[PDB]
Amino acid sequence: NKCDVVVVGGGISGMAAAKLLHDSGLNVVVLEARDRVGGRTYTLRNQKVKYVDLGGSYVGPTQNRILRLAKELGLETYKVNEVERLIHHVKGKSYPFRGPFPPVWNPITYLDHNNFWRTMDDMGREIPSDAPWKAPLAEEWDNMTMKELLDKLCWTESAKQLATLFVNLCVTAETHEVSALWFLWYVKQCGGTTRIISTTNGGQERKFVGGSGQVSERIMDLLGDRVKLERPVIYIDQTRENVLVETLNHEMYEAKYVISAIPPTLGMKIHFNPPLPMMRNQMITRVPLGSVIKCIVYYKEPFWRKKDYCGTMIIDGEEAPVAYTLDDTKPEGNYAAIMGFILAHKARKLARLTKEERLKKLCELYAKVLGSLEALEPVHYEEKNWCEEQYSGGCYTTYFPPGILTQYGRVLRQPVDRIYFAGTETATHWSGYMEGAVEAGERAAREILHAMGKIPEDEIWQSEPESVDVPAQPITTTFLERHLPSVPGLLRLIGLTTI
Amino acid sequence: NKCDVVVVGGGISGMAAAKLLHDSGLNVVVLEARDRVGGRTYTLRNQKVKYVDLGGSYVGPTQNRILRLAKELGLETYKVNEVERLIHHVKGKSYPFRGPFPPVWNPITYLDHNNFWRTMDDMGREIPSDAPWKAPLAEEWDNMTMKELLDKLCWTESAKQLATLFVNLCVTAETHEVSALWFLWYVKQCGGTTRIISTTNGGQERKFVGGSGQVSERIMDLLGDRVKLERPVIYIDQTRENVLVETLNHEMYEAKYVISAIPPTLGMKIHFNPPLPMMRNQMITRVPLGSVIKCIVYYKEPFWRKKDYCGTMIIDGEEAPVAYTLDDTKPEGNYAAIMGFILAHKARKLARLTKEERLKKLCELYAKVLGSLEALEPVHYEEKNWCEEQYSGGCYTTYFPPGILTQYGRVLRQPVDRIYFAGTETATHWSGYMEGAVEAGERAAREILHAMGKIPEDEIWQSEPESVDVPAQPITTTFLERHLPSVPGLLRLI
Numbered sequence: 003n004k005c006d007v008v009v010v011g012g013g014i015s016g017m018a019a020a021k022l023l024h025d026s027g028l029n030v031v032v033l034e035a036r037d038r039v040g041g042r043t044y045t046l047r048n049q050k051v052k053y054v055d056l057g058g059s060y061v062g063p064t065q066n067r068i069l070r071l072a073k074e075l076g077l078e079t080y081k082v083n084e085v086e087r088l089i090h091h092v093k094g095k096s097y098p099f100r101g102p103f104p105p106v107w108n109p110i111t112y113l114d115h116n117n118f119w120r121t122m123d124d125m126g127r128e129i130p131s132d133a134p135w136k137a138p139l140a141e142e143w144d145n146m147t148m149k150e151l152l153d154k155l156c157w158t159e160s161a162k163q164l165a166t167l168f169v170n171l172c173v174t175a176e177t178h179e180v181s182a183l184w185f186l187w188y189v190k191q192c193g194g195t196t197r198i199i200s201t202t203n204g205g206q207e208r209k210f211v212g213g214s215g216q217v218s219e220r221i222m223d224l225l226g227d228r229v230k231l232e233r234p235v236i237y238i239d240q241t242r243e244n245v246l247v248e249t250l251n252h253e254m255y256e257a258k259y260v261i262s263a264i265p266p267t268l269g270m271k272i273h274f275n276p277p278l279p280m281m282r283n284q285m286i287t288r289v290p291l292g293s294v295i296k297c298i299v300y301y302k303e304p305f306w307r308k309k310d311y312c313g314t315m316i317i318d319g320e321e322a323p324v325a326y327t328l329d330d331t332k333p334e335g336n337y338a339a340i341m342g343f344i345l346a347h348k349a350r351k352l353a354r355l356t357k358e359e360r361l362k363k364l365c366e367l368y369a370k371v372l373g374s375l376e377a378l379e380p381v382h383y384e385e386k387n388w389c390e391e392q393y394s395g396g397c398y399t400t401y402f403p404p405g406i407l408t409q410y411g412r413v414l415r416q417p418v419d420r421i422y423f424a425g426t427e428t429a430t431h432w433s434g435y436m437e438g439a440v441e442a443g444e445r446a447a448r449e450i451l452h453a454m455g456k457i458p459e460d461e462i463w464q465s466e467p468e469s470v471d472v473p474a475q476p477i478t479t480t481f482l483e484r485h486l487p488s489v490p491g492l493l494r495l496i497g498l499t500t501i
Numbered sequence: 502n503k504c505d506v507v508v509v510g511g512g513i514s515g516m517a518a519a520k521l522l523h524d525s526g527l528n529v530v531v532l533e534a535r536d537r538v539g540g541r542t543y544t545l546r547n548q549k550v551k552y553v554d555l556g557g558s559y560v561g562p563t564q565n566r567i568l569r570l571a572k573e574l575g576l577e578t579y580k581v582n583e584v585e586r587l588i589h590h591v592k593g594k595s596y597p598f599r600g601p602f603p604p605v606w607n608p609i610t611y612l613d614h615n616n617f618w619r620t621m622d623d624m625g626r627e628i629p630s631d632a633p634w635k636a637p638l639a640e641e642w643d644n645m646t647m648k649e650l651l652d653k654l655c656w657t658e659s660a661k662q663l664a665t666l667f668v669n670l671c672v673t674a675e676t677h678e679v680s681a682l683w684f685l686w687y688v689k690q691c692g693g694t695t696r697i698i699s700t701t702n703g704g705q706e707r708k709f710v711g712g713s714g715q716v717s718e719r720i721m722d723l724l725g726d727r728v729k730l731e732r733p734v735i736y737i738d739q740t741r742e743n744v745l746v747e748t749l750n751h752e753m754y755e756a757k758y759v760i761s762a763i764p765p766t767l768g769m770k771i772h773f774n775p776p777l778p779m780m781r782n783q784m785i786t787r788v789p790l791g792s793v794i795k796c797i798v799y800y801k802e803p804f805w806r807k808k809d810y811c812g813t814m815i816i817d818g819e820e821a822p823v824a825y826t827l828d829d830t831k832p833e834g835n836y837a838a839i840m841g842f843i844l845a846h847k848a849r850k851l852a853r854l855t856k857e858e859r860l861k862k863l864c865e866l867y868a869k870v871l872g873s874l875e876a877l878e879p880v881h882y883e884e885k886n887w888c889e890e891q892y893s894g895g896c897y898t899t900y901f902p903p904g905i906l907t908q909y910g911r912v913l914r915q916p917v918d919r920i921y922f923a924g925t926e927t928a929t930h931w932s933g934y935m936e937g938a939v940e941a942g943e944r945a946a947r948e949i950l951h952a953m954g955k956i957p958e959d960e961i962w963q964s965e966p967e968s969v970d971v972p973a974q975p976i977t978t979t980f981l982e983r984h985l986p987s988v989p990g991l992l993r994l995i
């Protein structure tokens with residue numbers, strides 16, 4: 003019945019919030035819709051895989067909050083395999099390479115590729131992390147899709163195709179589905195293009211030993227019976243002295259404050275009294291989550307390494323079911339595996355097939371890309387379609403269609419009376435990620451601590467010391483990368499000398 | 502507890518569905534979330550206004566289903582005032598005119614305006630009403646916003662500005678918010694540009710005497726205690742022999758079938774067991790409703806008529822709070838009034854003000870446009886902001902952002918086990934309107950009648966005889982309208 007704070011949702015964000023509040027001496031209850039904690043993280047255990055992340059998995063340098071939280075819980079990381087060459091597969095052929103960006107030889111195409119990535123970051127520098135709608139050209143950029151932006155920016159098909167893949171992979175949505183402003187914000191708030199795309203020195207550097215689901219599970223262990231499973235919240239009443247929160251099983255919870263730690267659109271599953279203010283009422287119908295199937299194919303050995311391939315494949319083209327893969331082999335070198343994502347419209351199209359049909363299409367793709375018949379001999383397969391989850395709505399995260407972020411964005415983490423808002427979608431650094439979940443949950447908890455007079459306004463937003471275990475190397479560019487002209491820039495230089 | 506069919510939602514669609522099933526001899530229950538029926542229609546009664554429609558109001562020729570249903574319930578219509586001149590207000594000046602389309606005098610601008618409207622209809626002819634995702638260029642058109650389309654199509658700022666106003670008014674959304682394919686479908690399925698924009702011989706020809714809320718109220722009267730008010734549905738369970746439907750007050754209802762007669766995205770307010778199939782699960786997070794405040798300013802007399810103005814104003818520009826008005830005066834000539842819409846981003850911006858501040862801005866605008874100081878002397882004001890409604894989500898209707906209709910559109914009216922889908926959003930003719938609500942409710946009810954073996958598949962979709970009271974005149978074009986070149990077309994001839 004009665005407590006200090008009810009947290010709605012037992013994903014990483016809700017669990018981080020609850021843990022902070024609990025450590026501060028308050029009585030907290032976590033109401034979780036599912037028969038498990040973790041949300042968009044899920045670690046499956048069986049004898050064939052030992053453990054496998056079917057949801058969120060990767061962490062890396064500059065993600066100091068998730069790293070600190072997991073270390074406190076007794077977790078360790080290991081490095082994703084990137085010793086050997088990466089592969090860019092374009093127009094039916096594989097081109098091995100090293101370094102984060104797929105290289106290009108054609109001088110015109112080189113200028114176009116260089117300019118695309120540079121311009122993404124240039125534009126991002128004008129967008130405040132904590133208030134993207136404050137960018138000088140916020141309106142113009144928000145009223146365009148990423149498809150429109152790419153059409154104007156990319157002078158070669160080669161750059162446009164790679165750029166399209168980048169968007170599909172970053173946000174599991176099509177270029178025509180998403181606001182240019184929101185996407186530019188999304189990349190900037192992860193530290194930019196290099197940081198977001200990189201394995202070594204980027205967002206995909208590491209995974210947790212034993213799975214990321216242990217973060218939420220081990221917090222649940224600390225909280226004991228304060229976490230209530232199979233308690234979907236259906237109703238929140240703020241008309242009286244104490245806030246009343248009701249679940250689907252008719253249980254009633256009374257609290258001083260509430261933290262909503264669920265995807266913004268999933269707030270629609272709750273009936274509010276009094277009704278939400280107009281801007282939030284409409285906002286929560288305007289913010290879908292992307293579409294992805296995470297697929298892991300198991301093999302007897304990590305055979306790709308013997309051909310000097312690390313397992314990373316960047317795969318261009320409509321025909322390919324998977325556009326991106328990473329080596330998912332255990333750090334011990336056993337349970338050899340390739341992880342791959344089926345993205346956006348392909349997730350919709352291929353969900354029609356059976357599990358066995360999808361396994362076949364993936365093996366046949368990998369055999370082609372890796373040039374290896376061994377790829378046709380899987381020993382096991384695991385997969386998870388996140389589009390089917392009632393209490394997630396999609397993965398990895400929420401995207402904003404054109405026009406929404408400038409009109410409704412300021413509403414996202416604005417408290418509604420005694421309801422405060424967490425969830426990775428409300429973060430200002432690595433929003434969309436486990437790191438953003440920790441930032442948002444802890445910030446929401448501190449907002450309540452301030453409302454109770456326990457801390458000064460000063461302490462609501464707190465910086466995080468850099469991890470000693472996962473240090474960040476700075477992002478650098480070369481003189482040529484900074485100053486080489488764009489394609490239209492070269493054409494004007496050509497017009498100039500005609501004098 | 503037990504019945505043949507539970508209908509979720511007591512708007513026109515739910516009520517039309519329940520009425521059909523009831524008349525066929527089945528036991529129906531209507532579960533309505535609010536303390537009233539009518540949904541996106543709402544008729545307010547008081548001494549100052551007598552009655553006023555604060556939600557859906559207009560009906561016209563080709564809307565034969567709403568007209569038949571209303572007539573059966575004992576309702577009459579009257580004609581919206583369009584005797585005198587309409588006004589197009591552009592760049593701070595009023596230009597009176599006659600006929601449905603605001604005219605232009607510059608020759609290049611004429612070609613551009615003519616081509617814009619014509620192209621909207623040309624493109625619409627390639628889009629099947631019952632399956633817009635089957636259009637030959639479905640993907641290309643769905644991957645563009647209406648803003649992009651207008652940028653390519655409109656060679657003059659004059660046409661682009663009018664076209665933008667058209668989009669804002671039709672679907673209460675910005676051009677950059679909505680899919681080009683969805684918008685072209687939307688116009689086509691109302692019968693095209695002339696039919697959708699016209700008062701005389703179009704969608705805005707008429708209103709109901711006493712208000713449109715009477716449609717839902719009078720069906721409630723027929724159904725008696727079968728309508729349950731303040732019963733928001735929270736849970737639907739389809740795992741067992743009979744479907745179980747639970748409300749917020751913990752009441753439990755058992756049925757053979759369910760009709761969901763609520764806006765698609767409002768399906769999110771219901772927890773499903775088993776979970777919805779993946780496509781519907783995601784679809785219902787991708788389909789928002791538009792933004793509008795409906796505002797009615799009352800005056801001692803319909804003073805605009807004395808200046809040979811009917812009360813219709815088409816008002817261009819960012820500064821104007823209201824882009825479109827109609828005469829809302831009663832057929833008797835009393836309760837003189839102007840109805841206006843505050844649309845899309847302006848609804849969001851101006852909601853911050855007080856009621857009195859909004860009234861002042863509207864009166865000042867109307868004084869300018871009508872060229873009359875009398876507009877500064879209102880006797881009364883009524884307004885409704887539909888963006889604040891938990892059980893509507895907006896108005897008039899659901900819009901589709903780029904990419905959604907092709908990927909998720911086929912899911913809209915696909916049954917989920919024993920749940921069938923009504924609501925104006927599922928109609929194929931005047932979807933978005935009270936007419937579409939009726940079509941969809943009755944079609945969903947007949948789907949259940951077929952599933953029960955009471956009617957053949959043949960009878961699920963049924964044509965409607967033309968109203969004798971509101972006959973449709975055909976839409977015509979002139980030889981010059983059909984064959985005059987576009988601006989780029991003239992440039993190639995040069």
Ligand SMILES: *Cc1cc2c(cc1C)nc1c(=O)[nH]c(=O)nc-1n2C[C@H](O)[C@H](O)[C@H](O)COP(=O)(O)OP(=O)(O)OC[C@H]1O[C@@H](n2cnc3c(N)ncnc32)[C@H](O)[C@@H]1O
Pocket residue numbers: 010011012013014015016033034035036038039040041042043056057058059060061233234235236263264265268271272294295296388393394396397398399424425426427434435436437439
């Ligand atoms: C799915 C996914 C996510 C993902 C990604 C790949 C996939 C396939 N890869 C990632 C990666 O490699 N690294 C990373 O950092 N992130 C990655 N992502 C995203 C990541 O998993 C998410 O950002 C993060 O897990 C989100 O955490 P958050 O706490 O903000 O949100 P949640 O996990 O969705 O938790 C919400 C919980 O609330 C419950 N819920 C929902 N509705 C209710 C109601 N009505 N009542 C009570 N509880 C409710 C959910 O069940 C969930 O547990």
Ligand SMILES: *Cc1cc2c(cc1C)nc1c(=O)[nH]c(=O)nc-1n2C[C@H](O)[C@H](O)[C@H](O)COP(=O)(O)OP(=O)(O)OC[C@H]1O[C@@H](n2cnc3c(N)ncnc32)[C@H](O)[C@@H]1O
Pocket residue numbers: 509510511512513514515532533534535538539540541542555556557558559560732733734735762763764767770771793794795887892893895896897898923924925926933934935936938
């Ligand atoms: C608001 C509006 C609408 C409108 C328009 C101008 C405005 C400001 N002008 C129109 C016009 O001039 N002519 C016309 O034909 N239409 C016009 N529109 C649109 C029109 O009002 C709508 O298309 C029509 O009313 C829609 O009817 P429908 O039956 O399909 O939908 P509804 O009215 O929204 O009814 C839904 C009912 O369901 C209840 N509800 C919602 N959630 C639940 C739950 N969970 N449980 C039980 N009931 C629920 C709603 O309360 C509503 O009553």
Ligand SMILES: CC(C)=CCC/C(C)=C/CC/C(C)=C/CO
Pocket residue numbers: 060102103104168171172198199200206316398435
């Ligand atoms: C290497 C290139 C061209 C693109 C990589 C883009 C990217 C963000 C990959 C990471 C995808 C991922 C694991 C998302 C889940 O957080």
Ligand SMILES: CC(C)=CCC/C(C)=C/CC/C(C)=C/CO
Pocket residue numbers: 559601602603667670671697698699705815897934
């Ligand atoms: C005549 C012009 C330029 C625009 C009119 C367009 C239009 C659809 C008007 C009707 C608006 C309305 C009452 C919508 C609600 O159904």
